[PDB]
Design a protein around this motif. Sequence first.
Motif, PDB file in Angstrom:
ATOM      1  N   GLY A  79      59.590   9.899  69.612  1.00  0.00           N
ATOM      2  CA  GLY A  79      59.593  11.222  70.214  1.00  0.00           C
ATOM      3  C   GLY A  79      59.520  12.333  69.167  1.00  0.00           C
ATOM      4  N   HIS A  80      59.604  11.960  67.888  1.00  0.00           N
ATOM      5  CA  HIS A  80      59.559  12.908  66.798  1.00  0.00           C
ATOM      6  C   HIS A  80      58.143  12.947  66.252  1.00  0.00           C
ATOM      7  CE1 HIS A  80      63.736  13.277  67.187  1.00  0.00           C
ATOM      8  NE2 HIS A  80      64.101  12.433  66.281  1.00  0.00           N
ATOM      9  N   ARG A  81      57.370  13.921  66.731  1.00  0.00           N
ATOM     10  CA  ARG A  81      55.991  14.073  66.315  1.00  0.00           C
ATOM     11  C   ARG A  81      55.643  15.554  66.366  1.00  0.00           C
ATOM     12  NH1 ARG A  81      56.091  10.722  70.180  1.00  0.00           N
ATOM     13  NH2 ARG A  81      55.295   9.152  68.706  1.00  0.00           N
TER      14      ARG A  81
ATOM     15  N   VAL B  59      59.721  13.879  62.053  1.00  0.00           N
ATOM     16  CA  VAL B  59      58.452  14.114  62.732  1.00  0.00           C
ATOM     17  C   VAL B  59      57.291  13.978  61.758  1.00  0.00           C
ATOM     18  CG1 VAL B  59      59.695  15.969  63.947  1.00  0.00           C
ATOM     19  CG2 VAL B  59      57.502  16.505  62.799  1.00  0.00           C
TER      20      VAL B  59
END
Lengths: 234, 234
Positions: free
Chosen positions: B169-171, B184
């Motif tokens: 979910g870290h992008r 991210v």
Amino acid sequence: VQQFKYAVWNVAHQYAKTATFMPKPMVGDNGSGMHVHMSISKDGKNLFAGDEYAGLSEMALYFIGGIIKHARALNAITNPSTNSYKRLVPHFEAPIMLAYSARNRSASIRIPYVSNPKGKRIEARFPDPMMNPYLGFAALLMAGIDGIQNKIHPGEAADKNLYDLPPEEEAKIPTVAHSLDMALEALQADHEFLLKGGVFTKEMLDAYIELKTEDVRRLNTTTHPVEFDMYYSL
Amino acid sequence: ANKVLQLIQESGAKWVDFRFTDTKGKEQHVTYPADSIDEDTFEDGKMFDGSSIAGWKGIEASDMILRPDAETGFIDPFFAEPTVVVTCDVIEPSTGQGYERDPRSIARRAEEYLKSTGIGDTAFFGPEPEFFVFDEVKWDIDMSGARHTLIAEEAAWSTGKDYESGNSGHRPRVKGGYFPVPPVDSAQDMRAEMCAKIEDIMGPGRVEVHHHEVASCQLEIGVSFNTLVRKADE
Ligand SMILES: [Mg+2]
Ligand SMILES: [Mg+2]
């Protein structure tokens, strides 16, 4: 209205499909709206017909004024869904500006080309199908007649342009409610016109407000996927 | 060549990779054993066919192995193998821009056509080339149609996709990959290795800065400015 909804729901269902009178179910495309056309007759004569403005009686100008005055409150009962405010967004095809014109979009109130003055009416484009027909129509009338009774001037008609530069104006142009939250706060403040005639009891209005607030609660309590987008990795 | 030949000695390399550049700007390579490479070879050169720039001529141009600099041990390949990114392409007679035109020689020509003009001794160029790194990239074009797809974990749209290691979910969000921190970023060590490899190739220093460019999966590494025909090679 209710019968129409029923028909469309069920016909669709018979075609193995589903119908929804929700506003903005799809983001990035057009919302579904309920423009409301209104006239008053007395002994079978259209009181709205006149030669004040684009065939409008002073009566109708006052109708307009009242509605514009009480609009934020009117946004509950009409726009009674948290979803309604997804529709009411600063963009095109948006009746967000509280004004009137026959030939202008972004006018929350619009005067239809009626040809024969016999059917002259006024249209309010801000409501969505979530509005209670009964309660909604009624509230519009009460606000309308408050206009008449208090000879509320609807102000000048903006026909020129929807949304442009702010000459310290346009910014100043009034807007309809941003949230059901706000709409319910507005109706708290300004409910008097409804109570007149005892049409609306205070029992029911205060109930209605609380019941609608549960809808607000839901939205405000439930995290939205979009929050993940913005906030997850902060 | 003082640089090259000596490097060959020091490396104990058995293979020497002659690299030149086509008109379209794509580096090309041919590999020779060290045994054939003498100082005279820099003068005399090694000859080869012309199939990219030229044709019909049945051209048998020579690859005049250029000597100073661009004598880099092939960082990636297994066997010890220096590269000679310096391989100017010369016609058999008229030691000149081979095929239609050898870009490197055109650039050498311009090197002279600055001192010759007496405007300047040297010109300095400092390019900032941006690149994207994806996990995987697929495309095809037929009569059936044309299709192309980008695949990457860091891609903005990869939220909601399933992964082996799971989805972090870290992008980076769209346009929003301007320098956010490693959770991210998901590069860093890769860029670092890229930088390390660059230093193996060109030399120490030379690498200025490494950061994540705006677009998802977009990276920038900074390399020091240099003269033409040097910087071009770099
Ligand atoms: Mg309409
Ligand atoms: Mg940049």
